[PDB]
From a paper:
The entire outer surface of many bacterial and archaeal cells is covered by a two-dimensional array of proteinaceous molecules, a supramolecular structure known as the surface (S-)layer. The H. volcanii S-layer is essential for cell survival and plays vital roles in cell shape maintenance, mating, and many aspects of the cell cycle (Abdul-Halim et al., 2020; Shalev et al., 2017; Tamir and Eichler, 2017). This S-layer consists of repeating units of a single 827-residue SLP called cell-surface glycoprotein (csg), which is highly enriched in negatively charged amino acid residues, highlighting the adaptation of H. volcanii to hypersaline environments. Using electron cryomicroscopy of two-dimensional sheets, we report the atomic structure of the S-layer from the archaeal model organism Haloferax volcanii. This S-layer consists of a hexagonal array of tightly interacting immunoglobulin-like domains, which are also found in SLPs across several classes of archaea.
To this end, we purified native csg protein from H. volcanii cells and incubated it with Ca2+ ions. In the resulting mixture, we observed S-layer-like sheets with variable curvature, showing characteristic top, tilted, and some side views. We used single-particle cryo-EM data analysis to resolve a global 3.5-Å resolution structure of the hexameric repeating unit of the S-layer within the sheets and used it to build an atomic model of csg (Method details). The atomic model revealed that each csg monomer assumes an overall sickle shape and is organized into six β-rich immunoglobulin (Ig)-like domains (D1–D6 from hereon), of which D1 is highly divergent in sequence among other haloarchaea (Sumper et al., 1990). The csg monomers were packed into the sheet as hexamers. The 6-fold symmetry axis of the hexamer contains repeated interactions of D1 around the central pore, which is ∼13 Å wide. The pore is lined with negatively charged residues bound to metal ions, likely Ca2+ or Mg2+, which, in agreement with previous studies, appear to stabilize the hexameric interface critical for lattice formation (Cohen et al., 1991). The csg hexamers are packed into a p6 two-dimensional lattice, with inter-hexamer interactions mediated by domains D4, D5, and D6. A conserved α-hairpin motif in D5 forms a prominent trimeric interface, while stacked D4 and D6 from adjoining hexamers form an extensive dimeric interface, resulting in a lattice with almost no gaps. The key trimeric D5 inter-hexameric interface is stabilized by several functional divalent cations bound by the α-hairpin of D5, explaining the observed Ca2+ dependence of lattice assembly (Cohen et al., 1991).
Numbering used by the authors:
A (entry chain F): 353 to 669
B (entry chain A): 35 to 352
C (entry chain B): 35 to 193
Amino acid sequence: EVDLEVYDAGVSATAAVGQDATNDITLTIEEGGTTLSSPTGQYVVGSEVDINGTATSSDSVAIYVRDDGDWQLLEIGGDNEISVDSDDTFEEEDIALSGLSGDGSSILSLTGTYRIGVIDASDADVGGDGSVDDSLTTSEFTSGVSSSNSIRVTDQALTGQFTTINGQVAPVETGTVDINGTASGANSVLVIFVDERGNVNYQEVSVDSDGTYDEDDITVGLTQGRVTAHILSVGRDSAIGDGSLPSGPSNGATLNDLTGYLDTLDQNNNNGEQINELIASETVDETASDDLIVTETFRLAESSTSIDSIYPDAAEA
Amino acid sequence: ERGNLDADSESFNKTIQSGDRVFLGEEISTDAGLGASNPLLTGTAGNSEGVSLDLSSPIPQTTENQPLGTYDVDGSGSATTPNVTLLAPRITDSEILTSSGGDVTGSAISSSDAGNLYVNADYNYESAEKVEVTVEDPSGTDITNEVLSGTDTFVDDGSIGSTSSTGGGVGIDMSDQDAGEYTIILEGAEDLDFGDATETMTLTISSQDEIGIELDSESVTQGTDVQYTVTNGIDGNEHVVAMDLSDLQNDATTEQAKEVFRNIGDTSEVGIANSSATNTSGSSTGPTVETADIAYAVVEIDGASAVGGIETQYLDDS
Amino acid sequence: ERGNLDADSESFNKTIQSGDRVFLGEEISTDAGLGASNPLLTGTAGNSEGVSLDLSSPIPQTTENQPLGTYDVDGSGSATTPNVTLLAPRITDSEILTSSGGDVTGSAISSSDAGNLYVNADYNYESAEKVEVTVEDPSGTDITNEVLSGTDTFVDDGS
Ligand SMILES: *[C@@H]1O[C@H](CO)[C@@H](O)[C@H](O)[C@H]1O
Ligand SMILES: *[C@@H]1O[C@H](CO)[C@@H](O)[C@H](O)[C@H]1O
Ligand SMILES: *[C@@H]1O[C@H](CO)[C@@H](O)[C@H](O)[C@H]1O
Ligand SMILES: *[C@@H]1O[C@H](CO)[C@@H](O)[C@H](O)[C@H]1O
Ligand SMILES: *[C@@H]1O[C@H](CO)[C@@H](O)[C@H](O)[C@H]1O
Ligand SMILES: [Ca+2]
Ligand SMILES: [Ca+2]
Ligand SMILES: [Ca+2]
Ligand SMILES: [Ca+2]
């Protein structure tokens, strides 16, 4: 409870502390239950997620991560603060939790169960700083207006599917297939087609922010025969295989870097089986990388059409 | 100083000098100038002739007793004396704009975008009384001293459209205040606050809302152009409406792609673009139908919404 | 150029010259001509005498405060100065016709017969501001740049 007291007209400011109030009015004050809504429960490492919640009685907020220790701040913004609207609601969508410089990001970058909390920016600092403090202990985080939730970061998952007409492909001159699937946690996906004769083709697909990818009208410019397609996605390390390809850069080997290695496989005298074995040994089995692939096979047959059965609208097949 | 209030930084001046204009409703001082030398004046020509004027008393705010014109000491006589030209107070125009430019008066603006709002106005009576701005919340309480931003409460005449506090206008901030309708009242410093001498503009502070795209229909056949509407954007700003080239028919050439969007209505420009280059309707040196990535229309929203259109030909039946 | 907008292909001109007519609602520029030399003018005869006019401010669109007539520097005085003659904006006539001739305004015309429609109009204020045409669909959306055919959007007076 808190009261406002009016004083007699004409009284001075300094002298008014002594005399009794002519009248007064009282009112009650209650705290604001700031809390988070979006990040809770399951989460996929490396995946961009939205952040939203309510921050009643606050103007700016900060987000901290905890695992059996102090709360570490995340460098979500330049000022490390999120403004609060007139509706006591804050939101900062499409942020990569695992892609930040702070130690909380590194903690969230490894699979496991952790805690994520929100605190008031005004209560965030503990030394008169004009910005959010980097680290706060349990007592400091609990004392101020704050809330916490349990989070559980898990490994990435990859799935895919090809649109085979009959298990084969459109005419060899313009063979066309489509791909779809889910690649949550990644930013780009690669697809490669290898024939039995050692010719290779590749294509890069930008996965949507929700983790679902769907590409249509992909041209397979290979020779007629058995052709194996592989779909590749980089793991947490964002490097293919060991990250040290036998050719080109030896560090930070991305899919675009792997295209350079692919460009040399076809020129060699290797066949389809040898190319498949080399790519499986280098991309996946090398140093037990976290990158994930899926496989499919199809025959690039020539156009063909035939009639199977003819019958009246009766019981016949 | 009469005529030039900025000479002594005064908000007003009531020391009339021979020949200087005088507006309706002024309470002329009688201590200097014509206020003491010639307190009584007579009209010269037109409807003014015969009619008298007294500087020792406030001038009526209506023309029914003080017709507009030139007033002399001799009136209709051939003698030319210290004269007074009577006019009417009037605010020609007023606007509320953003520091980047663009009128936002009466519209809905988010709290974050109201950081550096400016109020400008052009009026008639700058030679006598500076105009003054009062900001009131939805409940009508004065909040001028709480939202004032680094400037006084006096708007200079002219300088309409100014987006900086260097000259003219008054800078205000509305980020701190909550959502609602706020009234900005411009009125004379002392006396000229009646009729055309005052104005009441409105501003709508709202929560940050997403840019809403709407179509007049959902299921349409090919060849039937469809109009789309963009809403909840900042007035006088440019948005980009994009179409994925995957939905475009494969057999379509560059020209078909470069005409998916029309130049109808508020649309400012139409073309195609990729991550590196663009081909507009006025050129062909940009990306081809395969080289480009998407089709795009740059639209400049005016008011609260913008309207554009699309031709649904050369599009897949999905 | 005042009076002759086609001299510099301008769509308007607000540089008033001594004696040139001025219409209601004009926002006269104060950088050249009478806009800076004589910002204040006084009426001469009729209802105009006594009434004042300010070039530094937009002229009211109604005659209740700016009666039509000739305005001088000396007003009713015998001296003749740079004057301004005030009139009223007015569109005398307008029509929509077919390339073969024949007014078709307000009537019903087939889609095929609307290939080469023409819009013409005679008005009063060609000396100051060219008239401009805006085409709107039944829903009111501007379609001027989509239906324009090989000409600008400015209609010359007469013709
Ligand atoms: C009007 O201007 C005169 C001239 O400086 C000044 O003396 C008065 O105080 C002011 O009201
Ligand atoms: C009105 O009086 C002024 C001087 O006050 C004179 O300059 C004008 O010529 C007259 O009309
Ligand atoms: C965008 O289009 C240009 C040609 O206009 C091409 O050079 C680029 O490679 C493409 O991304
Ligand atoms: C009015 O005409 C003058 C004369 O050429 C020109 O200088 C101005 O720019 C125009 O507005
Ligand atoms: C009005 O003023 C013009 C010159 O501006 C003069 O030519 C006329 O004779 C006068 O009535
Ligand atoms: Ca390697
Ligand atoms: Ca890896
Ligand atoms: Ca006289
Ligand atoms: Ca005269």
